């Protein structure tokens, strides 16, 4: 009779963090994504790696 | 806890009453057998609460603290008597199965056991 008193918390407390998470997660990475390409080094990253391919696959 | 520490057999109660509750004891057997049975089943109690665990993992931490000194200082009683009357009338009926019937049978098997001494004439 005690437990169902401590445990809505517990588990609102996993829910609400999730749908933080989320909503969050969705809301931050529908906001910033697109400066990244005015880095041309985001695709130095890509050729950095990739020369790193190219000598370091070979 | 299992059956009450008294325990008398179940065929020495089950067979044989008084004249008065003669259809009664048939009944309060069968009433006695499910109850014995019913109460032998159970774990007398639950564990307790690891409470260092809830106060840690439910994040809502001092909800938690009010249900510690509440459930560590609320206990519970075990159920009172209402019916060990039955005892008292338990120290009637042998009064009645031993003393009265017994010397009353004392003397009437006697009456007959005499005249069967009168018939060894």
């Known amino acids: 009779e005690v437990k169902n008193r401590l445990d809505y918390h517990i588990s609102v407390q996993n829910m609400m963090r999730q749908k933080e998470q989320e909503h969050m997660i969705n809301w931050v990475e529908k906001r910033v994504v697109q400066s990244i390409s005015a880095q041309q080094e985001k695709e130095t990253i890509a050729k950095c790696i990739a020369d790193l391919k190219l000598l370091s696959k070979k | ?121």
């Not at chain 2, 509750?21 to 159970?42: G, I």
């Not at chain 2, 993992?57 to 060990?84: M, Q």
């Open chain 2, 1 to 121: 806890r299992k059956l009450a520490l008294k325990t008398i057999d179940w065929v020495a109660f089950g067979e044989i009453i008084p004249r008065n509750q003669k259809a009664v004891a048939n009944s309060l057997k069968s009433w006695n057998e499910t109850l014995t049975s019913r109460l032998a089943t159970l774990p007398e109690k639950p564990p307790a609460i690891d409470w260092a665990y809830y106060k840690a993992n439910v994040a809502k931490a001092g909800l938690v603290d009010d249900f510690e000194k509440k459930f560590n200082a609320l206990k519970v009683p075990i159920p009172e008597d209402k019916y060990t009357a039955q005892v008292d009338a338990e120290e009637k009926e042998d009064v009645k199965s031993c003393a009265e019937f017994l010397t009353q049978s004392k003397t009437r098997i006697q009456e007959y056991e005499k005249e069967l001494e009168k018939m060894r004439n």
